[PDB]
Amino acid sequence: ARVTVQDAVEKIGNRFDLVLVAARRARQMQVGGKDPLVPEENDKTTVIALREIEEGLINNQILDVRERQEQQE
């Protein structure tokens, strides 16, 4: 699992904002159809999104830039 989310909160800087960004990413990953930016060690999309946030690979700006690129293409 993931007993604590301290590092992801440290990255994002607000706890409520972490909950929103992680939910957006997890929805992209489960229903939209996307590939994890980290190995999926038998983890649910919620935990995978959280541990992508932990490593600085995802945040609101990054999600937004990628989505605007997709809209252009």
Binding site: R15, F16, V19, R27, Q30, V31
Partner: protein, 99 residues
């Protein structure tokens, strides 16, 4: 006692109550305050509408769950529609204003 979905009341279309009726758990004010003390606004919203008496938002939730898509379209509780009808059946004119 555990319940997922069951029978519903006639006027207030809310989960029935008890084990015989296979009812649900009562979620009251002191538990609402507890969720407000956290920031859990989506948990509160789904406990008030999709899980209790949002009639057409509770079947969509079931279909979404059996589709592997964990998302809700809340809508409006039926405890508020009945309230509007009861206030309007007095002489008062209470209406929802356009966005």
């Amino acid at each position: 006692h555990a319940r997922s979905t069951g029978s519903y009341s006639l006027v207030t279309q809310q989960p029935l109550g008890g084990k015989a009726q296979f009812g649900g758990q009562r979620f009251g004010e002191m538990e609402v305050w507890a969720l407000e003390a956290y920031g859990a606004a989506y948990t509160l919203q789904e406990m008030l509408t999709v899980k209790s008496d949002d009639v057409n938002g509770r079947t969509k939730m079931y279909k979404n769950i059996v589709d592997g898509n964990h998302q809700m379209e809340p809508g409006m509780p039926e405890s508020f529609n009945v309230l509007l009808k009861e206030i309007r059946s007095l002489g008062i004119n209470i209406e929802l204003e356009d966005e």
